[PDB]
């Protein structure tokens, strides 16, 4: 299973078979024999396993990371507070890599299924990619290899100033 909201998937619409030839579809036969000889024995092996995994049911949790003071709340030089603001940002920055991948999975998953209509029926997924990319580029692009929170902050302040100077004229 998986969450169908994280990974949206249009319902399948298979036309019902319309066989108007006298001959037998050889696909539909090896599909029966495949179910009896391959699918059926395997499902027993899996049902056996999941009855063991039910007897030894174990649990694990997603770790919670409360929020710590931002970098903006750190006096210059106080490495004790910079360190925690830096660790948090690195955690945040990493979750943003995986958000981008998820948005990319959708766009790739849509391109395949729409097939010859991707130029039309993949607009919404291409729009989220185009939007979530602009945000990503506005946060993390050009930081460099030694990227950190302080550089992320410096890049934002330099951009908030270049836009304030847009209206200071207009």
């Amino acid at each position: 299973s998986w969450d169908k909201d994280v990974y949206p998937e249009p319902p399948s619409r298979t036309p019902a078979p319309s066989p108007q030839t006298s001959l037998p579809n050889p696909i539909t036969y090896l599909t029966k024999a495949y179910d009896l000889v391959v699918d059926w024995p395997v499902t027993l092996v899996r049902e056996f396993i999941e009855r063991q995994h039910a007897k030894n049911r174990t649990y694990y949790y997603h770790r919670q990371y409360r929020r710590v003071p931002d970098i903006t709340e750190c006096k210059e030089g106080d490495v004790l507070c910079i360190y925690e603001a830096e660790m948090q940002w690195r955690r945040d920055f990493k979750v943003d890599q995986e958000i981008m991948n998820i948005i990319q999975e959708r766009l790739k998953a849509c391109q395949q299924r729409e097939g010859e209509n991707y130029q039309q029926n993949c607009a919404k997924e291409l729009e989220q990619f185009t939007k979530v990319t602009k945000a990503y580029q506005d946060r993390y692009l050009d930081l460099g290899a030694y990227y950190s929170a302080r550089k992320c902050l410096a890049k934002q302040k330099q951009r908030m100033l270049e836009e304030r100077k847009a209206a200071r004229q207009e």
Binding site: V79, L80, Y83
Partner: protein, 63 residues
């Protein structure tokens, strides 16, 4: 162990390394002032021992 230990040790290390860094910069500022002004316990340079001045009455009065 959990992440706590490595995290809070790294906090403990960073504090030690940070306090040391400020002491080292403070010693240079201190040594610069004591040496140039001679008003501190360091860089005291010798002056003649006054205990060997002869305080007795002399053969002459004007002394």
């Amino acid at each position: 162990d959990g992440p706590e230990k490595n995290y809070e040790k790294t906090l403990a290390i960073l504090q030690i390394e940070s306090e040391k860094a400020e002491l080292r910069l403070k010693e240079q500022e201190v040594r610069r002032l004591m040496r140039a002004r001679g008003d501190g316990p360091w860089y005291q340079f010798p002056t003649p021992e006054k205990e060997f001045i002869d305080h007795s009455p002399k053969a002459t009065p004007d002394n």
